[PDB]
Amino acid sequence: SSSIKVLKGLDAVRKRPGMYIGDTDDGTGLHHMVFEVVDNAIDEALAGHCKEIIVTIHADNSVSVQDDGRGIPTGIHPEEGVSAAEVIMTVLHLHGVGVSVVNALSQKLELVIQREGKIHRQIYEHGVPQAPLAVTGETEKTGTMVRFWPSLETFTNVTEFEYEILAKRLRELSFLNSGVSIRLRDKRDGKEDHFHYE
Ligand SMILES: CNc1cccc2cc(C(=O)Nc3cccc(C(=O)O)c3)c(=O)[nH]c12
């Protein structure tokens, strides 16, 4: 059972967030949540499909990452009875460990996928999907959007995202991945930036 594995992996991440995300007391793990989601969007860029990424700090202290790539495949996976996107959002395999870590450590996560003319949406709570991915509407755009509300059971002390921390790494990432265009917007004060290196 994939379902059994999935919940074991999630539970493994909650019990040992240090080895997956970093220190949970000093801010580093909290911001590493953003960078992990961002790194997935960059993969879609490196793969040649995404060109703009927008990172938003929301005023309710969640962060969203939007890409204009293909959008995570929505097809019920041939292997596990749920959408391929749910697999990517929930399956652990530190070998092959990725964005499930963020899902596990978020009190809530919102996933919106635009592809093949359709908008698909799923909500997760502590990594657990409220329902299967479902079509909520129609669109002519493509891409993936992950917004996450970090668990305040997991994170102490530094619980609010810092603009400058996110600006510094995003600037570095566009530098290292020349050609990727990344926008950062703060909804708390209206501050924004655009990082591209060519
Ligand atoms: C903010 N953005 C994102 C956050 C978190 C995860 C992903 C995953 C993906 C992806 O997995 N994209 C992809 C698209 C089409 C095909 C395949 C495939 O492997 O067959 C993969 C992506 O594009 N953005 C992401």
DSSP string, 88-133: HHH----TT--THHHHHTEEEEEEEEEETTEEEEEEEETTEESS--
> Resolution in A for the shown PDB structure?
2.1
8 Å CB contact between 20 and 152? no
Q: How many CA atoms lie within 13 A of 157 on its CB side?
A: 9
Give residue 63's identity as a one-letter amino acid code. V
Coil, strand or helix at 83 = strand
Task: Report the C-alpha gap between 127 and 194 in whole angstroms.
Answer: 31
Residue spans of the domains in the chain: they are 1-198
Distance (angstroms) between ligand 1 centre and the Cα of 43 equals 8
**Among candidates 166, 36, 57, which has minimal Cα distance to 101?**
36
**Among candidates 72, 10, 38, 73, which has minimal Cα distance to 180?**
38
- Which residues are catalytic, by number? 36
User: Atom 21 (ligand 1): residue with closest C-alpha?
Assistant: 72
| C-alpha torsion 66→113→141→190, nearest 10 | -30
Distance (angstroms) between ligand 1 centre and the Cα of 156 equals 30
DSSP string, 25-82: SSSHHHHHHHHHHHHHHHHHHHTTS--EEEEEE-TTS-EEEEE-SS----SBPTTTSS
Coil, strand or helix at 197 = coil
Structure solved using which method? X-ray
Q: How many CA atoms lie within 13 A of 51 on its CB side?
A: 0
147 lines ligand 1 (CB under 6 A): no
Contacts of 174 (CB under 8 A, 6+ apart): 180, 181, 182, 195, 196, 197
Count of beta carbons in the 10 Å neighbourhood of residue 46: 12
Mutation probe of ligand 1 site: the residue of 36, 38, 70, 115 with most atoms within 8 A of C-beta: 70
Phi, psi of 9, deg, nearest 5: -65, -50
Place of tokens 């002390």: 157
Please give the C-alpha separations between residue 147 and each of 57, 99, 102, 172, in angstroms, as whole numbers. 10, 12, 10, 22
For residue 45, give both structure tokens. 């860029």
Topology at the third CATH level for domain 1-198: Heat Shock Protein 90 (3.30.565)
